[PDB]
Amino acid sequence: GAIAGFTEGGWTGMVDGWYGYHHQNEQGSGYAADQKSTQNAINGITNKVNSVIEKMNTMKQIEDKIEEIESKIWCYNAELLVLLENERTLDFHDSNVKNLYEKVKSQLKNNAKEIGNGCFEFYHKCNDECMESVKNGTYDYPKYSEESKLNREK
Amino acid sequence: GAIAGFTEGGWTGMVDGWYGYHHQNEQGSGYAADQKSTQNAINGITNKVNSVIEKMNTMKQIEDKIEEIESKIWCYNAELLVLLENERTLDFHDSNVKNLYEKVKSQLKNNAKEIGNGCFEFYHKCNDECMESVKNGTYDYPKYSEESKLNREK
Amino acid sequence: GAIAGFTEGGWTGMVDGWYGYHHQNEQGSGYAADQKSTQNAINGITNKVNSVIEKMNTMKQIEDKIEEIESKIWCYNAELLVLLENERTLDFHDSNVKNLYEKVKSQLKNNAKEIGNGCFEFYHKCNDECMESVKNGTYDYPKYSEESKLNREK
Amino acid sequence: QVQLVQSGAEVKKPGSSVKVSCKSSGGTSNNYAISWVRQAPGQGLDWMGGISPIFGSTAYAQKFQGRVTISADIFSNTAYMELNSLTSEDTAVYFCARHGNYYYYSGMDVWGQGTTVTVSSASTKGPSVFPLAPSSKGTAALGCLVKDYFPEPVTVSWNSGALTSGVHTFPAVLQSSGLYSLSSVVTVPSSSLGTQTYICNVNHKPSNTKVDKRVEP
Amino acid sequence: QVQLVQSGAEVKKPGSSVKVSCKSSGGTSNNYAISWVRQAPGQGLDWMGGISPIFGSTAYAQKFQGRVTISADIFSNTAYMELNSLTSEDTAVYFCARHGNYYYYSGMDVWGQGTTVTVSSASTKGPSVFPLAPSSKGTAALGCLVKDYFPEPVTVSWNSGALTSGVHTFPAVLQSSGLYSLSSVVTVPSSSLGTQTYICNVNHKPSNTKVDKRVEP
Amino acid sequence: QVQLVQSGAEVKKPGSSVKVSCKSSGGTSNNYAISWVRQAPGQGLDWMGGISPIFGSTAYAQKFQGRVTISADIFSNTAYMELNSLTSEDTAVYFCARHGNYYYYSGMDVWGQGTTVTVSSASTKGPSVFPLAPSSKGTAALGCLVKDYFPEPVTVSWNSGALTSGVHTFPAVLQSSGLYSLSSVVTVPSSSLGTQTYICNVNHKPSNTKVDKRVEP
Amino acid sequence: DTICIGYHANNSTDTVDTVLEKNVTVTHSVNLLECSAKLRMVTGLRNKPSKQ
Amino acid sequence: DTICIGYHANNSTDTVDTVLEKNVTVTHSVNLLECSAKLRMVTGLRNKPSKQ
Amino acid sequence: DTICIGYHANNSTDTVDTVLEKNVTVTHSVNLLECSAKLRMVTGLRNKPSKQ
Amino acid sequence: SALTQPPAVSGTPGQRVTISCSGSDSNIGRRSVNWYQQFPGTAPKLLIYSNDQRPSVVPDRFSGSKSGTSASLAISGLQSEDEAEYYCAAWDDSLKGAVFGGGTQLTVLGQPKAAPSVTLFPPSSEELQANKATLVCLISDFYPGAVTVAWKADSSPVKAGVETTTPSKQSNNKYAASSYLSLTPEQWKSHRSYSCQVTHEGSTVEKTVAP
Amino acid sequence: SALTQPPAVSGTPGQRVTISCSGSDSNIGRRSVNWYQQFPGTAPKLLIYSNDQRPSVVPDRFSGSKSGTSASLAISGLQSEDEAEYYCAAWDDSLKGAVFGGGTQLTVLGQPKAAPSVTLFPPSSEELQANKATLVCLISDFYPGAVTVAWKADSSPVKAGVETTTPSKQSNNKYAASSYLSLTPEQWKSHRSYSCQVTHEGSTVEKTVAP
Amino acid sequence: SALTQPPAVSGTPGQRVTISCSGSDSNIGRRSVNWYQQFPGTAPKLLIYSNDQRPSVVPDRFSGSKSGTSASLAISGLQSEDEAEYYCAAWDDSLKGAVFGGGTQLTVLGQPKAAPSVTLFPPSSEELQANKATLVCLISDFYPGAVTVAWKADSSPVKAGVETTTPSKQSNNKYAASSYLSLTPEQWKSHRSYSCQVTHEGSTVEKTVAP
């Protein structure tokens, strides 16, 4: 109905990256994904892959019964090393984007304050101008502390 | 002393099923377990079992030293596949019964409201009549919205 | 800047043990670690170690190809049994010290009350006298209920 | 296609113990509660208890409490019932039954063939079978006489169960000496007389006597 | 030192399909988006689509949608493009390109050598090479004549790529019979005349003809 | 029944280094802090440092900081102490001790036999043992003379430690030449004279001389 | 009035191991060994009885 | 006005297993088998689409 | 006045792997190899130092 | 036993008759009742569960109700194949056990007198060689069930060695019985002929065998 | 195609000239533009990305700007090695695809007339034995590019069998072309001598071969 | 060293005497003190820990107190087997190290004069064959400890080659000492007889050996 924020789901509409943002100032909607950390994630994610795939490959029935032994081991050996990095690929994701929260609670300060759900309503009105600076990591706050300090009044 | 609710423990007294309810209207106590989802749980739980047990079973000292090799592998192989589905049998449980919460927060609406602990006090008085309908999944709410809307007054 | 409490970090300054306390009455600072449960932790921790290390150790290329087979198994077998008790060594830690919370919420009662972070401010003034009794497990509360009940006034 | 297949009938002397098995053939019943109910000859049903192996419940009737042990093997899809300190009142036919669900409130919807358990001071002996020639009468009568067997019960089939029409197998009689005897007969047409042969299957587990005799003109 | 190495040129008749490979040699590009862009002879660049294997995106140009399939093998660090229902307009040179990042907005920074794909009703035949003797002229001229080859294109090198200076290899001509022919020449000094030898390498994949003839006085 | 068993005495010349081991025999001490404390001859106790392997603490006395390394092997239940840049003041007896708990505040409750470490400019030589005949005197005296050994210390036992009563082993004397010598004697009864034999065990590790001579009439 | 939703508990002393945790007591499980002698598989839920 | 930080979701039906959990649907993964026939490795994130 | 309960931290740079997580820095562990060269076992706790 | 049923019921073909089950608050009063069907010597089949609910195989003519502390079941268009005993059942919370009714035997208003096929069997030949003589009179084809058989040596009756079974139902349900005459070949060598005499509802049928 | 470029540009060595790219709101208007360089027969190289950003290998003389709905690039101190075609590119959200400009061909104000080296090649000897005769006139060393070659048998021209290529750039860039004279050894056995005649900007060069 | 102890103490059998330990705020002042026992040449035993706490093996006669910045220990019913040195110990936070007292030597009011058993040992026979002669005078059985031994060749003393040990405690504790006479078989061949002369508290004992 409305939109979202993390807590209750991811964003089908955001396609520019794994992680990223979207804003609604009075101009209009528009999903904008974070190239910043979507990249350095993938790079490591990519590095986890080959690091996994680097491990693939090192009396008649004796030979067979052995052949089937390491057909057995290796095949579960893999299964072992699949569930592992899979789970920890997935704590790596959720980690990053709570890190992509500290993102600007260490920047948006007290100008918006947690809606709870993972969104923010500004004591400001933040145009393209402004969300871009957030996205840039630019977001100053001598900005216009004052009005928000006033706007705070609410 | 009082009774309970999930948060701080399970119910020794409830024996009719894994998951289920208990109510205290002015008539009297009585644990009533949810056949609904206790069954479809077990069915899957049961299906997890045989799916596990389907995997059991596929120069002098060479033969032995091999025999003891897959005595070794298989025996830990199992140990592997025991801790796994055990843990995820146990996220399956807790999952279901938070699902057995959404149960009627998507039904009890705002007529009772979360005690916190996992119980509810009605802005209503809900007799056998009424808890049965909850249990049935019947629980209408043109019921008597009004009085609760009044009762809400509190 | 200030000090801490669990929630946002452990204590570099506390060296007397794994788990333990520190207090600030008007006398002065001083980290005091809990020998009580730091010991019975280690003892079990120690017992987990040897229990792990008790498992170490039970046609030409046939012999080798086998030798390398259990070089393979055992070496990952270990790797298996390392991540396991490592993770559950680490739920054992966090468990203990929430147990080292119930410690005196089942003792400090309502004389201090949760700062949230894992510290306490007393409706009392608790000198060396007093924190020692906490540390001892002595901490009575016919103590001086009254003044805290008054101090509570705040 | 699930069916419950119970072990064959057993007979033991009093004070001894017996274990009865119920195999879920064609699938598993582990996700169901299975109950044991006994029917003494010409008597009503009596609940003994039940087990729901995956659910984790094992229940007992109050009267049979402490004397009966009910168990299940999930691997083999087989549930077992064992009764101890047998007396003459424990002589009965024992059924295994599956409830509609994991619990005992639900109706029992798949039933075993039933297993006869007989408590008698006694020493088991095997039957001797002798043909009953098509002496009497488009229709004719032939049979097998089952002689001297202890204790009950015995099953009879003809030609490996291939023979199905017009066969009636009689109740046993208990003689003064104390031994059972019986006859099994089937009336089949007179037309095949001479060409076609009749063969008898007699089996009774306590003796585990499974015995064959063929009837000739 | 990453470079993208594409399979050699292919020629297939219309309505058939072709698969082109791009190998990331000297490293992986899996953490990058790779796009396929085509340039028809003397024409502008045309985006066909792209894939980012680890990110999980596969994108297609609208005009080529449903006709093109782009894939990657993470193990081999190779990306593949396959086009179907070929027609004459699909005759072109196909490049593989790596974006600056995991996505297609970023600039394409590593480029393959390019692969020529020719759509012609035709039956592939191999070239015959004949030496062009240092007949003409401190400087001299020698060459190889590449005769009767279908379809385009052919690569020529001299003495295993060892020979680099003053070599010019000509464009082909399409004869009335419909077959390509070409000459390759290099002007090298007259000083080594008699002592030192020149060797020719001619290869063209559709025929997969790689052919060698050495030129003598 | 835990006991700490230290390696035997060692002697090394100054500026060299020595490693001393303390084995927890009959169990593990890994869950305990173990400290190293040294006692120079006729001097007070001196804390060198300690280690608590499972807890993760390794502590050093300030004076010995940077010169001493204390380590533990959890597998072998053995803790090690190594001192470097030896000088004459480092000549002493070194003990290993277990605290009451994982930490160093607690009392040291199991003590090793102690290991003697001697720092001397010197070249180790082995002792020669010669019997001391029961010449002198219901009581008699016999002994072994330990001759020419460097450096200290030597252990003497009689008949494999089987012989326990009335044995006194003397302090060594340092001769003008600079070599130690000693005698060991035991007074035992005169009654067994002729029939029963006495055997001597002499061992001192720096030489690792363990030497046997039996005394005869 | 009130209604509560709950899960089963009992007096079972049976225990199992999980990847994450050790010797958890649960109300019911089946034992798979008709080697190293440790293979209990859980069917029931975590055993956390009320008190009274 | 508002700004939200979000993660990707899509219409992928692909699923993987983790130590802890089974058949989780994720937006993208690579398949490693160029034996027991179960070896999918995740690259994408947990697939939890909004709704509208 | 206040009292706080805390756990140890230090300047250890040592790290281990768990089922769930990778290279966690912990205050103390023992190394078991007196093969694939990865077998550190933790004894200490997660290393999460205050700051000042 | 906790549940109450009439010992026996009867009905005419096609009529509706009903069987009642009375329990206390401990069983039916708070829990559902299931009722079961038994044909002789075979296992039960489930007809109704959850008070009024009916199973896939069962005819609509069976239908149910339960009220208060009692439950009852009506069989409409009663038919002859329905001849069997049916049992009420329920969970009992006091017993923490399943309970059954005493049982009710249903009879369908009989069909006319039908005379027996009697068959008498000879010593098998091996059996006389074995030490044996036995006569088997198989009395078959009878309807409704209780009669007496008297056996003669010559034309004279023999009391000794005679054991006669009490009647049993055939599969399409009318009755058959067995009586055996035990005795040794000398008894046989000596005789006559032997006969088994069946008299039904006052009318007698006989068959004879001779050595 | 979504992006607009002039078809061709020219410049003198050392001058600054600029090439423009016009798009709509769907491409450049909301997204960055990348522009590419193509020398003939080889793959493109990336010069600028993210509007004004410049790659490590590229000379500062290239620099960029984009405005509103259009973008343009200036090449200062234009030099001869720069002779090539360069393409604008951008992401298009409507297309959800990458787009390219039509392309712009850059010409550097030519350098003086340079005459060709012409080389004519003989039938290889195996080739006459093979059924064959072919003459290869390799016309090389030419600057700027388009001329005509006429071939004679004796001193008389031959129209039949002549195929002449359209000109191509050499690697340090001036042009060369190929023409082939096809025909069978009898044609060859019979003749004369053969010649390839190249005339450039009205002046003719000839070489001759004889059997 | 941080902790203060009297160098030596004495007591009569049965009396109570006390030994003190003074530290500063850095050690005992904020932490518990442990004190240790040493008998000569052997390892220490722990007597008290945590100020006043007593170990399972230790007699109640030992008991403890510590006050302020000092600690002291009383031994009641002092007995002779108690003769040994005992050390105070504590953790020091400034040093972040364990500290020990200087040590205190306990003496029990002596028991009466006891004369020595002196034993003189002959060259072992192999030893004279080996190049050797040595005399071993074993002076044993002595109480309390310090005396002088002078040795004679004939009846004349020999200064050269004589090395005499300083006294040592036996295991049930009274003292013994060793003196050796070194010298070569010619010295031996030549002589007389040899004697070791022990004089204790002014009274002399002698034993003699001859070749």
Side-chain angles (χ1 to χ4, degrees), chain E residues 114-200:
Chain E
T115 292
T116 311
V117 172
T118 306
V119 192
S120 163
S121 67
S123 158
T124 136
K125 303 191 236 179
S128 310
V129 306
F130 311 130
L132 301 168
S135 208
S136 306
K137 177 197 177 62
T139 258
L142 51 104
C144 282
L145 169 68
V146 187
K147 132 197 180 214
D148 88 339
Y149 71 88
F150 198 72
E152 200 96 357
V154 62
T155 182
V156 181
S157 62
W158 286 82
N159 290 259
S160 145
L163 224 64
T164 162
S165 271
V167 206
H168 345 292
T169 47
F170 286 10
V173 71
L174 182 73
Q175 300 152 248
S176 35
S177 260
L179 221 33
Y180 291 134
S181 288
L182 246 171
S183 285
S184 313
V185 61
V186 55
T187 312
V188 168
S190 176
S191 57
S192 57
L193 291 181
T195 170
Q196 171 284 334
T197 65
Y198 300 96
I199 292 146
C200 298

Side-chain angles (χ1 to χ4, degrees), chain J residues 69-165:
Chain J
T69 53
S70 158
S72 186
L73 218 141
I75 314 165
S76 76
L78 185 71
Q79 202 277 349
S80 58
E81 268 67 349
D82 301 338
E83 227 161 32
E85 187 281 1
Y86 60 82
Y87 297 95
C88 197
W91 179 264
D92 189 292
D93 58 326
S94 298
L95 284 52
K96 293 180 182 122
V99 297
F100 288 92
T104 295
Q105 168 66 234
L106 181 132
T107 308
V108 271
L109 284 225
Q111 101 136 14
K113 171 27 197 177
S117 40
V118 173
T119 64
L120 176 55
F121 288 94
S124 178
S125 67
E126 147 148 28
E127 161 266 14
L128 306 183
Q129 338 313 325
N131 310 349
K132 314 289 203 46
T134 306
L135 284 76
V136 193
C137 300
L138 299 182
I139 315 129
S140 190
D141 202 324
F142 315 61
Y143 206 57
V147 209
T148 68
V149 79
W151 290 5
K152 58 198 61 163
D154 321 83
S155 296
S156 65
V158 279
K159 5 202 162 297
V162 50
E163 300 243 356
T164 91
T165 71

Side-chain angles (χ1 to χ4, degrees), chain J residues 2-3 22-32 90-93 99:
Chain J
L3 292 191
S22 285
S24 33
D25 176 318
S26 173
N27 43 65
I28 70 212
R30 15 170 69 131
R31 287 189 185 281
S32 332
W91 179 264
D92 189 292
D93 58 326
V99 297

Side-chain angles (χ1 to χ4, degrees), chain A residues 3-16:
Chain A
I3 186 183
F6 272 31
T7 292
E8 310 252 359
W11 301 350
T12 69
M14 195 186 41
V15 204
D16 296 35

Side-chain angles (χ1 to χ4, degrees), chain B residues 63-99:
Chain B
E63 154 162 329
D64 294 16
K65 172 224 253 208
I66 292 159
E67 150 180 347
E68 326 326 303
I69 271 177
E70 49 282 353
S71 76
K72 255 290 299 187
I73 306 172
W74 179 98
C75 174
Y76 291 138
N77 188 318
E79 193 167 320
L80 319 190
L81 320 161
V82 160
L83 308 195
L84 282 187
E85 84 296 5
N86 265 9
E87 242 293 342
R88 59 175 70 102
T89 298
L90 267 41
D91 62 33
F92 160 61
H93 282 304
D94 65 53
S95 85
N96 292 332
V97 223
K98 322 208 170 166
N99 297 336

Side-chain angles (χ1 to χ4, degrees), chain E residues 39 108 111 147 170-171 174, chain K residues 36 44 87 132 138 163 168 178:
Chain E
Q39 200 169 202
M108 310 177 276
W111 289 76
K147 132 197 180 214
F170 286 10
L174 182 73
Chain K
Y36 297 91
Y87 297 95
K132 314 289 203 46
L138 299 182
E163 300 243 356
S168 322
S178 315

Side-chain angles (χ1 to χ4, degrees), chain L residues 42-63:
Chain L
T42 67
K45 117 189 172 285
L46 173 71
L47 221 59
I48 158 172
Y49 62 95
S50 290
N51 311 102
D52 53 13
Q53 286 8 288
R54 184 183 33 98
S56 51
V57 285
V58 176
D60 50 350
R61 345 177 308 183
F62 295 95
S63 104

